[PDB]
């Protein structure tokens, strides 16, 4: 028996109220049957007495209240999963977009998923060689980590994300990555950049894609990354795959959350964003890692543009408190021709210690990383002083650091979006730059490493 | 019914608060439906519904309206009439013909509650049937055309939602109300006219979008060279007041290689709309003998016209653009200014008592802007033809104090690939167009570079890259000059400044009101930039061969003056520009001796 | 007449059990003590009307007061007898003059000119001020504001333009409408005495609103003035110049009213509709195709903290067709008026200059004078930072040019009227300082004919 009511009380933007209902549950999936026969899905946000408040993913344009119905499906929003999803393209609600067959689902999964028991978790420590020195050495990515790219409008975050997915591999293994890609409010041209890259490399045959574009309904964006992550955790923990999840643009997700929060007249937090923004983002990004006794894994690379290039904006700020580091692109490095324009100083990886060193990368990894960071921060400071007060205003040693920071940006960080460096090549190059400095300045590195590696 | 008879549902106004009206007894009406409000019957749109009470956004002034007055729904969404009679017309925000408005009301001022069809439903047009009877058709298919102007064919297409076989069709003289074709559908016989309606808030359907990879020719040197827009691309023009935004957009309208221009005056000066209607008919194409007005549609809702109609004018415009795009045309849509559209949304959001987002703008500002720009682009249109068409969006933004960190500019830059940042300090310095060449960008530059290298068979992308490197180095050098003085720079750095100076005032600076400088061909642009770059190249080598900076400048007065005049060289005498290259090589080599 | 006042909360009042009440309809409150206050319907809902009383709600007893709904919005009773008369912010006589018999009453919001019916601003208005007439020409139908600051002589400049402004070869069809907004008694007295002393009053209509007048009256003031101007222009065929000061007091009043209604504040606390509101005033300027007459506006405003990006000058600049800038640097040098021509601009100046309007050498000398002055100021600043020996012999000439330009050309005095012919001739005298070879913006035909 299908539960349906013809008692719609009000329609206000993305929100609808239904009355005289019974047996309706919080977060239950609904379908609006419009007067013209069109079907639009939604979700119960609240139930009291004989009433239900629902949000409509596809909006309420053209709806006649009297002549429409609301069906209550008796379960929350689900994804019908299958390994047959591989190589398929879906929209923001998980419906086929590629004119291919309908998937015959193996099972149906609540797209909210479940929390991994912390005791069941396996700690991520498997080095992933991205081929990008600024990542591999200084902000190391390991399998099962969530490591986002913080960027801005007009910056090449899509180029970087594509390069990572293209070049990423663990060592001493022929494991590959199944890729789950979620487009969230991005433009056709942004989406098409990824589609073209996936088709050229042939990675599209290893991929599942969920596409919400800038012309697609905005409220749909709240479901899209949950769809993508449900597919990811399915492929990883039920089909034993190593999954790489790329989701852009996460800022568009938070904006959708704010639209709903504003429509509900909820008590606003910072910038009009709801008080639950941190929690909400955490329910997404914590869906990554490894599980003890299971072969698969979920590695996340969320991408967000920082509004006004402001890192203290609620979106990148709260994301930073959740994710395991961040890779930050800057307009300054981009304009100087640095590719990728990664600013290593505000960038971070929280899982680099146990994924590096002897038997993983090389024994000199951590020492050189610290010394390079220290030398770069001091050299960057000296450059900025010399450009304003003159090259003769720096001490003799700071003048050396100023030259180091320049070669560091131009030869180390800047490598090109199609250059894939081995970790050994990266570490050896780091040593060539440290050799510019007096040995007495290399205080983060012990004598045993200096004698062995320093030219 | 009542009193023994019955008619249609009549709503009753129960609240008036500025442009927001609430009416009860509106249960038959749908969200987004157009309605006639009050005794005056002013044009409004239903945006919310609570039980039988509709919230209505009114597109005319509501001064003098109150509760108890009737409301009459039309049963249809906000729509445009799409057919012959649309080109060369000036409409208001809701597609009412302004010249006809004036003649009918016999007034120079804007009255209220005036119902006018958008197009002339009485005018005879010659329909040329081009399709055969017995042909199976679907949405987008051409059944015939009308020569609306001497150049532009108005293609009559099967409307969306219609599918079947052509039963009867013949050429002849009809109005846009006469049935010109009979389609045998599965739902029975349907007759088509030359006019179709379309709801403005819904993008017209296509087959698929394509990459906009062909650069538009605006003839504006700074744009075509350093910050180019492609056909199907989108460009934002944010600037402070008095920076020449209107001259820039008018230049693009008159010189761009598009088939049609849709120009939307959204919340701006009335005199600028008057300037367009006066000037556009006078701008005659030498090749075809047609004026710019004969390929333009004008939509005007000035700053002191109804505020809600600012939003209407935006959607009225893009929908008309999509219509001509569907015919296989390249269309430019100019929105000036999108800031005033956002202000309208903010005003209504306040009336609705909504939770404010960034700067008081509603939380859905970003998605509204994103949805608008995603309607621009190069497409394959519907129809068995699989014809291609494009819409290129050029939008002014007016950020308070010229500060681009504000929500409208920021949300726009999130979805457009071209940013032409106008600069007040340049405008004061008489540097026009006032585009900041350091802050501006085009994410089409690399793709356009490839296209240009291929079509010119020259190293154009390298030249553009070198020209920008010089300007960027100039900005660095200028900071040093500010601190130490110009006499502290080496000869090599002194040269870079002079080359940058030549780029700035011999190339970037362009007079819109000069008969020759107003437009620069692609070929002419190549020759000009080549010559400028050659001087720097030859002078650079002279310095390395022992010549001093002072000597180089003193002995190249005549040739540098000739470079600075090359912008005025006629398009048929471009050999006079290319020959400067040899003169540069000669004089400098002589200086070395 | 209703005796059904239900609520009073601050300046806001709710009246129930009403019928036929419209948005923006004017109301009249007859207090329990016979006192009469006027108001406006801000919102009307079912049987309720939300009204704001101009003079406030202090002292009002609800049950014993009554409300009359007048059936029309705020209006001005217009006549050609307004010339030579002084009114307050609401169009009430302020000069103890005879009874005013209106030809008709007009909604002070006016109507919007059909964009297709609008005529582009055209023809010359001679202000008598060189820096304006020559370099930043005022055109009939133009909106050209003055951007000033506290302590700067914008009130002297306003009064000078008001009495000196004229159209050439056209007698007895020019009028000035002067609107004073939120100004003190003493500055109102300055304007009143000056107009009467010079005889400018005989061709003027004056609307005088004071600092202690109700804020709603302060915002009604410019609409009363513009309604009078449109009537004189379009119905009587006159060329009307509308001067209004201080537009900053207008915006402050608007913000005060906005806050009283607890509306969501926009940038810097000003209403979100500040742009739109200013536009409904400034766009009443212009010409109409087929009609004799024109309305020209000079809004005068003080830039808070001398900040041009402040919402008041900023939004004004986005609406007007140029701006006249007064600076403290020039004011401290004794330049009268202290107009800085470098950031100043008139966008429509082309439509009011040249042969038949001013003279054939107008545009060329303007381009040249502006260019020479900018180069002169640049050389002056170079001498400041690097010394006099940092200038070439030519740079020294341009620097000297910029001095005489400021001291002799821009500086003319607040009671000196220069004809356009005198202004142009004086421009040629300054240009003669420069070598003829340096006058690159002027063709040889003009140089040979005019250069002294
Ligand atoms: Cl402007």
UniProtKB/Swiss-Prot annotation, chain A:
Domain of life: Bacteria
MF terms in GO: ATP binding; proton-transporting ATP synthase activity, rotational mechanism
Cystine bridges: none
Acyltransferase in keyword set: no
The entry's keywords: Ion transport, Sodium, Sodium transport, Transport
Keyword Nucleotide-binding: no
Induction: By increasing intracellular Na(+) concentration.
Pfam families recorded: ATP-synt_ab (PF00006), ATP-synt_ab_N (PF02874), ATP-synt_VA_C (PF22919)
One of the GO BP terms on file: sodium ion transport
Family: Belongs to the ATPase alpha/beta chains family.
Main function: Involved in ATP-driven sodium extrusion.
NCBIfam families assigned: PRK04196.1
Protein name per its UniProtKB record: V-type sodium ATPase subunit B
Provenance organism: Enterococcus hirae (strain ATCC 9790 / DSM 20160 / JCM 8729 / LMG 6399 / NBRC 3181 / NCIMB 6459 / NCDO 1258 / NCTC 12367 / WDCM 00089 / R)
Curated annotation (Swiss-Prot), chain B:
Catalytic activity: 4 Na(+)(in) + ATP + H2O = 4 Na(+)(out) + ADP + phosphate + H(+)
Any one GO biological process: proton motive force-driven plasma membrane ATP synthesis
Family per similarity comment: Belongs to the ATPase alpha/beta chains family.
Recorded GO MF terms: ATP binding; proton-transporting ATP synthase activity, rotational mechanism; proton-transporting ATPase activity, rotational mechanism; sodium-transporting ATPase activity, rotational mechanism
Assigned GO CC terms: proton-transporting ATP synthase complex
Species this chain originates from: Enterococcus hirae (strain ATCC 9790 / DSM 20160 / JCM 8729 / LMG 6399 / NBRC 3181 / NCIMB 6459 / NCDO 1258 / NCTC 12367 / WDCM 00089 / R)
Residues annotated to bind ATP: 239-246
Entries under InterPro entries matching the protein: ATP-synt_VA_C, ATP-synth_a_Xtn, ATP_synth_asu-like_sf, ATPase_a/bsu_AS, ATPase_F1/V1/A1_a/bsu_N, ATPase_F1/V1/A1_a/bsu_N_sf, ATPase_F1/V1/A1_a/bsu_nucl-bd, ATPase_F1/V1_b/a_C
Gene3D superfamilies: 2.40.30.20, 2.40.50.100, Bovine Mitochondrial F1-atpase, Atp Synthase Beta Chain, Chain D, domain 3, P-loop containing nucleotide triphosphate hydrolases
Entry protein name: V-type sodium ATPase catalytic subunit A
Keyword Nucleotide-binding included in the entry's annotation: yes
PANTHER family: H(+)-TRANSPORTING TWO-SECTOR ATPASE, V-TYPE PROTON ATPASE CATALYTIC SUBUNIT A
Pfam families from the UniProt entry: ATP-synt_ab, ATP-synt_ab_N, ATP-synt_ab_Xtn, ATP-synt_VA_C
Function: Involved in ATP-driven sodium extrusion.
Transmembrane regions: none
Taxonomic placement: Bacteria, Bacillati, Bacillota, Bacilli, Lactobacillales
Record's keyword annotation contains Transport: yes
Record's keyword terms, sorted: ATP-binding, Ion transport, Nucleotide-binding, Sodium, Sodium transport, Translocase, Transport
Induction section of the entry: By increasing intracellular Na(+) concentration.
EC number: 7.2.2.1
Swiss-Prot record, chain C:
Annotated Gene3D superfamilies: 3.40.50.12240
Segments crossing the lipid bilayer: none
Domain of life: Bacteria
Gene Ontology MF term list: ATP binding; proton-transporting ATP synthase activity, rotational mechanism
InterPro entries, A to Z: ATP-synt_VA_C, ATPase_a/bsu_AS, ATPase_F1/V1/A1_a/bsu_N, ATPase_F1/V1/A1_a/bsu_nucl-bd, P-loop_NTPase, V-ATPase_su_B/beta
Entry keyword set: Ion transport, Sodium, Sodium transport, Transport
One of the GO biological process terms: proton motive force-driven plasma membrane ATP synthesis
SUPFAM superfamilies documented for this protein: C-terminal domain of alpha and beta subunits of F1 ATP synthase, P-loop containing nucleoside triphosphate hydrolases
Any Pfam family the entry gives: ATP-synt_ab
Induction conditions: By increasing intracellular Na(+) concentration.
Stated role: Involved in ATP-driven sodium extrusion.
Similarity comment: family membership: Belongs to the ATPase alpha/beta chains family.
Record's protein name: V-type sodium ATPase subunit B
């Amino acid at each position: 028996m299908i539960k349906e009511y013809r008692t719609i009380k009000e329609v206000v933007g993305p929100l609808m109220a239904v009355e005289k209902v019974s047996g309706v549950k919080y977060e239950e999936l609904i379908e609006v049957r419009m007067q013209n026969g069109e079907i639009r899905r939604g979700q119960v946000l609240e139930v009291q007495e004989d009433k239900a408040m629902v949000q409509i993913f596809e909006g309420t344009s053209g709806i006649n209240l009297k002549n429409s119905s609301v069906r209550f499906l008796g379960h929350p929003l689900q994804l019908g999963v299958s390994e047959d999803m591989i190589g398929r393209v879906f929209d923001g609600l998980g419906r086929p977009k590629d004119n291919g067959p309908e998937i015959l689902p193996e099972k149906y999964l609540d797209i909210n998923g479940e929390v991994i028991n912390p005791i069941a978790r396996d700690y991520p420590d498997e080095f992933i060689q991205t081929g990008i020195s600024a990542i591999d050495h200084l902000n190391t990515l390991v399998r099962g980590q969530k490591l986002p790219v913080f960027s801005g409008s007009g910056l090449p975050h899509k180029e970087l994300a594509a390069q990572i997915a293209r070049q990423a591999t663990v060592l001493d293994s022929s494991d590959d990555f199944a890729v789950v890609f979620a487009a969230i409010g991005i433009t056709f041209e942004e989406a098409e950049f990824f589609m073209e890259d996936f088709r050229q490399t042939g990675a599209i045959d290893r991929s599942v894609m969920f596409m919400n574009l800038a012309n697609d309904p905005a409220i749909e964006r709240i479901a899209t990354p949950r769809m993508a992550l449900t597919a990811a955790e399915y492929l990883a923990y039920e089909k034993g795959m190593h999954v790489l999840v790329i989701m852009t643009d996460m800022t568009n997700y938070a904006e959708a959350l704010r639209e709903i929060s504003a429509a509900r007249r909820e008590v606003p937090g910072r910038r009009g964003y709801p008080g639950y923004l941190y929690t909400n983002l955490a329910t997404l990004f914590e869906r990554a890692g490894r599980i003890r006794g299971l072969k698969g894994s979920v590695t996340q690379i969320p991408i967000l543009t920082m509004p006004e290039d402001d890192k203290t904006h609620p979106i990148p700020d709260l994301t930073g408190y959740i994710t395991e580091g961040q890779i930050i692109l800057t307009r300054e490095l981009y304009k100087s021709g640095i590719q990728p324009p990664i600013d290593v100083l505000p960038s971070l990886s929280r899982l680099k210690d146990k994924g590096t060193g002897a038997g993983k990368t090389r024994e000199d990894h951590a020492a050189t990383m610290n010394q390079l960071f220290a030398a770069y921060a001091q050299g960057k400071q000296a450059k900025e002083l010399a450009v304003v007060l003159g090259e003769s205003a720096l001490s003799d040693i700071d003048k050396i650091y100023a030259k180091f920071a320049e070669r560091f940006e131009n030869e180390y960080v800047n490598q090109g979006f199609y250059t894939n460096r081995t970790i050994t090549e990266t570490l050896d190059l780091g040593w060539e730059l440290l050799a510019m400095l007096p040995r007495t300045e290399l205080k983060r590195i012990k004598d045993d490493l200096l004698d062995k590696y320093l030219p | 019914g009542s009193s023994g008879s019955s008619g249609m549902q009549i709503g009753k106004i129960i609240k008036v608060s500025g442009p927001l009206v609430m009416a009860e007894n509106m249960s038959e009406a749908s969200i987004q439906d157009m309605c006639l409000v009050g005794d005056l019957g002013v044009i409004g749109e239903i945006i919310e519904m609570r039980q039988d009470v509709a919230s209505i956004q009114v597109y005319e002034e509501t001064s003098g309206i109150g509760p108890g007055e009737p409301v009459r729904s039309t049963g249809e969404a906000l729509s445009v009439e799409l057919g012959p009679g649309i080109i060369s017309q000036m409409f208001d925000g809701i597609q009412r013909p302004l010249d006809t408005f004036m003649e009918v009301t016999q007034s120079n001022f804007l009255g209220r509650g005036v119902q006018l069809p958008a197009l002339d439903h009485e005018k005879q047009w010659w329909f040329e049937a081009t399709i055969e009877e017995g042909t199976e058709v679907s949405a987008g298919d051409i059944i015939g055309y009308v020569d609306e102007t001497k150049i532009i064919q108005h293609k009559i297409m099967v409307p969306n939602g219609i599918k079947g076989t052509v039963q009867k069709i013949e050429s002849g003289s009809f109005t846009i109300d006469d049935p010109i074709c009979v389609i045998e559908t599965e739902q029975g016989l349907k007759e088509l006219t030359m006019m179709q309606k379309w709801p403005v808030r819904r993008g017209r359907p296509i087959k698929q979008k394509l990459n906009p990879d062909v650069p538009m020719i605006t003839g504006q040197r700074v744009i075509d060279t350093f910050f180019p827009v492609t056909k199907g691309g989108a460009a934002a023009v944010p600037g402070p007041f008095g920076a020449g935004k209107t001259v820039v957009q008018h230049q693009i309208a008159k010189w761009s290689d598009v088939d049609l221009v849709v120009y939307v005056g959204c919340g701006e000066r009335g005199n600028e709309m008057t300037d367009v209607v006066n000037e556009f008919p006078e701008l005659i194409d030498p090749n075809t003998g047609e004026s710019l007005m004969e390929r333009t549609v004008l939509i005007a809702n000035t700053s002191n016209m109804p505020v809600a109609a600012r939003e209407a004018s935006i959607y009225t415009g893009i929908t008309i653009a999509e219509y001509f795009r569907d015919m296989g045309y390249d269309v430019a849509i100019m929105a000036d200014s999108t800031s005033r559209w956002a202000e309208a949304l903010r005003e209504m959001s306040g009336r609705l008592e909504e939770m404010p987002g960034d700067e008081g703008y509603p939380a859905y500002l970003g998605s509204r802007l994103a949805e608008y720009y995603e309607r621009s682009g190069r497409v394959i249109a519907l129809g068995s033809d699989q014809r291609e068409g494009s819409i290129t969006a050029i939008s002014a933004v007016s950020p308070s104090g010229g500060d681009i960190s504000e929500p409208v500019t920021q949300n726009t830059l999130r979805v457009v690939k071209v940013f032409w940042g106008l600069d007040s300090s340049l405008a004061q310095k008489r540097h026009f167009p006032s585009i900041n060449w350091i802050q501006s960008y085009s994410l089409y530059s690399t793709e356009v570079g490839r296209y240009m290298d291929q079509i010119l068979q020259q190293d154009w992308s390298d030249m553009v890259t070198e020209g920008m490197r010089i300007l960027q180095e100039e900005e660095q050098l200028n900071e040093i000059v500010r601190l130490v003085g110009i006499d502290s720079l080496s000869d090599n750095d002194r040269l870079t400044l002079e080359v940058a100076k030549s780029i700035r005032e011999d190339y970037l600076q362009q007079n819109a009101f000069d008969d020759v400088d107003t437009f620069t061909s692609r070929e002419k642009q190549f020759n000009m930039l080549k010559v400028i770059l050659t001087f720097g190249k030859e002078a650079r080598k002279a310095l390395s061969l022992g010549a001093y900076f002072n000597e180089i400048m003193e002995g190249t007065v005549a040739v540098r003056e000739r470079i600075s005049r090359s912008k005025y060289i006629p398009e048929e005498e471009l050999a006079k520009i290319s020959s400067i290259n040899e003169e540069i090589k000669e004089t400098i080599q002589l200086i070395v001796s």
